Amino acid sequence: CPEQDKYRTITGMCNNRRSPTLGASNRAFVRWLPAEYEDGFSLPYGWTPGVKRNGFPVALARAVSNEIVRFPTDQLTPDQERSLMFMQWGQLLDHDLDFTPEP
Amino acid sequence: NCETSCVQQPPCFPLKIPPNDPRIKNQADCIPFFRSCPACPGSNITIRNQINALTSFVDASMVYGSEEPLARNLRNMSNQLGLLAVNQRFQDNGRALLPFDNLHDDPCLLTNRSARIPCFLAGDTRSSEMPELTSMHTLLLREHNRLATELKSLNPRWDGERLYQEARKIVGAMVQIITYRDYLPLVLGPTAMRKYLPTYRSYNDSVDPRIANVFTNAFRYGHTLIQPFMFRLDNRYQPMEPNPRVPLSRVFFASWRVVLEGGIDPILRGLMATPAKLNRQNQIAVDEIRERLFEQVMRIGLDLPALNMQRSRDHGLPGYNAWRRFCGLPQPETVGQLGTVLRNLKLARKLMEQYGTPNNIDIWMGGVSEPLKRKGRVGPLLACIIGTQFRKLRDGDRFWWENEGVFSMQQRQALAQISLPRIICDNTGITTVSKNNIFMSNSYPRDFVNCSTLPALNLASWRE
Numbered sequence: 001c002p003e004q005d006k007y008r009t010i011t012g013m014c015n016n017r018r019s020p021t022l023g024a025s026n027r028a029f030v031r032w033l034p035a036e037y038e039d040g041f042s043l044p045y046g047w048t049p050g051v052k053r054n055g056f057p058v059a060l061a062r063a064v065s066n067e068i069v070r071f072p073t074d075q076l077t078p079d080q081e082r083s084l085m086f087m088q089w090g091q092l093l094d095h096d097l098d099f100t101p102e103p
Numbered sequence: 104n105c106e107t108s109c110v111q112q113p114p115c116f117p118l119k120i121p122p123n124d125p126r127i128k129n130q131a132d133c134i135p136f137f138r139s140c141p142a143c144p145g146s147n148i149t150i151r152n153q154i155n156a157l158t159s160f161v162d163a164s165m166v167y168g169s170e171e172p173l174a175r176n177l178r179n180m181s182n183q184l185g186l187l188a189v190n191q192r193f194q195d196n197g198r199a200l201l202p203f204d205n206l207h208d209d210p211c212l213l214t215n216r217s218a219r220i221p222c223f224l225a226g227d228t229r230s231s232e233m234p235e236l237t238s239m240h241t242l243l244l245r246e247h248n249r250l251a252t253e254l255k256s257l258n259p260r261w262d263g264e265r266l267y268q269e270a271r272k273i274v275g276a277m278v279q280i281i282t283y284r285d286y287l288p289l290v291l292g293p294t295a296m297r298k299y300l301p302t303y304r305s306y307n308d309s310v311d312p313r314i315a316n317v318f319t320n321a322f323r324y325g326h327t328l329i330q331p332f333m334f335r336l337d338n339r340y341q342p343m344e345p346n347p348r349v350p351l352s353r354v355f356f357a358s359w360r361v362v363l364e365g366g367i368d369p370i371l372r373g374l375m376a377t378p379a380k381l382n383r384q385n386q387i388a389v390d391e392i393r394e395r396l397f398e399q400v401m402r403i404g405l406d407l408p409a410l411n412m413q414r415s416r417d418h419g420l421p422g423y424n425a426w427r428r429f430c431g432l433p434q435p436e437t438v439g440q441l442g443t444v445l446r447n448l449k450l451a452r453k454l455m456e457q458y459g460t461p462n463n464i465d466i467w468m469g470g471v472s473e474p475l476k477r478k479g480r481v482g483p484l485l486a487c488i489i490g491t492q493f494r495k496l497r498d499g500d501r502f503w504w505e506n507e508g509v510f511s512m513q514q515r516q517a518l519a520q521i522s523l524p525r526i527i528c529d530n531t532g533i534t535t536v537s538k539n540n541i542f543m544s545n546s547y548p549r550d551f552v553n554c555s556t557l558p559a560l561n562l563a564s565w566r567e
């Protein structure tokens with residue numbers, strides 16, 4: 001890990017001299033709170049039928065989408081104070097920060 | 104097996120179908136979902152965690168890459184000009200285009216079978232997802248090669264390495280300035296901005312710049328800002344025929360629309376002059392993403408908000424109250440209490456029917472349900488998650504543009520004059536761009552200006 005450097009590495013390695021992998025690509029995310037899994041360590045809530053979460057059944061993500069998210073496409077309220085560039089820099093920005101690989 | 108199968112066997116976690124669903128009537132069917140890769144496969148000692156395949160920093164890694172082999176494959180290594188490789192098969196009115204990507208099961212070819220146009224290759228794997236995104240990518244690619252040729256003329260002695268690096272460093276700062284000066288304050292609003300992002304003092308080597316597992320979900324708040332059409336505009340900012348208001352269900356992975364339907368220029372014109380969708384508690388997200396996400400390229404249309412919620416469950420994320428507790432916010436236990444926080448009982452009754460307890464509300468769903476902050480586009484909780492993450496990314500960045508040593512006093516003064524409208528000027532045929540601030544300006548011509556009125560980036564400070 002060089003003592004003097006002018007540029008970033010591609011992987012983000014060495015940005016933090018004390019803990020050099022911090023911020024670097026292909027590493028585990030930090031956790032701000034401990035993970036809540038059905039079995040305590042791996043299975044997500046909703047995996048096993050009839051297993052409740054904190055005393056209540058697990059609502060299907062699609063059911064929630066259907067009942068809360070859903071609205072008619074024509075009723076759309078446009079933002080008086082924000083261009084679509086704002087709902088695009090966000091996606092561009094997101095892609096500079098995080099990408100979660102799946103198999 | 105997730106792409107096709109409905110069986111819940113690892114690594115598949117398919118979203119089951121509720122009765123009387125508005126689109127999927129076969130309840131034996133489902134929505135495909137692959138469980139995110141575990142950081143430690145097959146373990147029984149460690150609590151499941153997920154991986155970030157990118158650099159957490161705002162270092163324009165979606166341009167340059169986050170892995171050494173790709174970063175090499177993205178450059179033009181055929182000379183010491185320090186440029187990023189461009190498409191050798193096509194160009195947009197003379198102007199540069201991102202190279203094509205050799206993929207085994209290329210989804211861009213499926214959008215228009217006859218056109219035979221594949222996905223693009225950029226610093227990030229998701230470049231061809233929506234033409235609007237590919238535009239921003241192409242604008243930045245052009246910007247690197249722009250800044251690298253301006254630097255070779257200034258310092259001809261400099262080789263391809265110094266040219267690449269110096270231009271990368273410039274772009275890297277440009278993304279930071281747009282983000283922190285113009286983007287974030289319009290996301291958080293003044294109060295949260297003062298709270299979570301007070302005036303940068305300097306680099307703190309004791310600040311964890313990593314992305315929190317939660318942020319990956321919380322930042323998907325942007326899905327509420329998505330409009331259902333791709334709005335294209337001609338030379339005179341007028342609807343460009345044919346296809347001015349194209350449905351989003353037809354633009355996902357439609358790379359052919361950038362190559363064969365008039366390049367970057369109309370898309371950027373559309374992004375500058377069209378307002379974004381506004382998040383309303385009765386108008387969360389459009390059916391172009393709720394019902395027809397990736398319809399052209401998949402066996403079935405996906406539901407992005409449902410995917411967001413299954414993803415937090417996959418990710419083992421705590422519910423609403425735990426995150427409110429974490430943020431130092433009141434945790435409602437009842438329907439009434441909830442109705443008070445959201446300033447909407449109609450919604451709280453709806454949320455209580457689904458979850459039972461505000462403890463179980465999935466983080467994304469909770470976050471998007473909150474009334475927005477003053478001059479902001481997020482609620483109290485998301486302003487906290489998003490605020491905290493951005494402060495860590497700033498204060499924990501050794502190569503942060505404002506950090507003493509990164510740039511010179513003059514270099515810093517020169518970079519302070521950049522803007523996204525000006526970047527659109529220098530890299531496209533567009534002569535009329537948005538009056539600053541770009542993210543607020545949405546009406547043509549009330550909020551517009553001519554190129555000439557915009558000062559360019561003065562690279563004088565870079566001369567050696």
Ligand code: HEM
Nearest residue numbers: 087090091094098099100233319322323325326410411414
């Ligand atoms: C281009 C329009 C967009 C489309 C079509 C889109 C589509 C998607 C899809 C399909 C995923 C994967 C969903 C899953 O399986 O869990 C995703 C994830 C994500 N999206 Fe969106 N999204 C878009 C815009 C945005 C915007 C504007 C933001 C933020 C302002 C955003 C932030 C995210 C984040 C953070 C993730 C997870 C990133 C990661 O892998 O680490 N998206 N989006």
Ligand SMILES: Nc1cc(Cc2cnn(-c3ccc(F)cc3)c2)c2[nH]nnc2n1
Nearest residue numbers: 099100206208209210222228229230232
């Ligand atoms: N994890 C994801 C996933 C997606 C969906 C997506 C984007 N690109 N791709 C893709 C890219 C190439 C490919 F061969 C197959 C899929 C899928 C996102 N869109 N925006 N941000 C995203 N983050």
Ligand SMILES: *[C@@H]1O[C@H](CO)[C@@H](O)[C@H](O)[C@H]1NC(C)=O
Nearest residue numbers: 179181182186187188189190
């Ligand atoms: C490399 O750069 C030169 C000069 O701009 C150009 O002629 C050549 O096509 C470039 N190659 C690639 C792969 O971009």
Ligand SMILES: [Ca+2]
Nearest residue numbers: 096158160164
């Ligand atoms: Ca990055």
Ligand SMILES: [Cl-]
Nearest residue numbers: 031032316317
């Ligand atoms: Cl977390």
Ligand SMILES: [Cl-]
Nearest residue numbers: 190191202203
């Ligand atoms: Cl090519």
